[PDB]
């Protein structure tokens, strides 16, 4: 989801909650944030399920790609943000 830019902050949102920390890997290439979540084969109410996804973001310009941070939520939402320089 969401793409929240402050004037001097920089933040984005990603529902991941069918993930554990552990089966998420986020990587800055560039001006790029890269996201890829993974998770075997897994019983639920439904059945029997897994998943995959790979998702990009543009960082602003003005955003160095060093200081971008993340965490993730007890409501399973990863976070990625970083300060603006300017």
């Known amino acids: 989801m969401e793409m929240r830019l402050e004037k001097d902050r920089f933040s984005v949102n990603l529902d991941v909650k069918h993930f554990s920390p552990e089966e998420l890997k986020v990587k800055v290439l560039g001006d ?5 979540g993974k998770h075997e084969e897994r019983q639920d109410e439904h059945g029997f399920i897994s998943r995959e996804f790979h998702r990009k973001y543009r960082i602003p310009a003005d955003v160095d790609p060093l200081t971008i941070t993340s965490s993730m939520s007890s409501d399973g ?4 943000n970083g300060p603006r320089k300017q």
């Open 77 to 80: 939402v990863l976070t990625v």
């Open 32 to 36: 790029v944030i890269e996201v890829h």
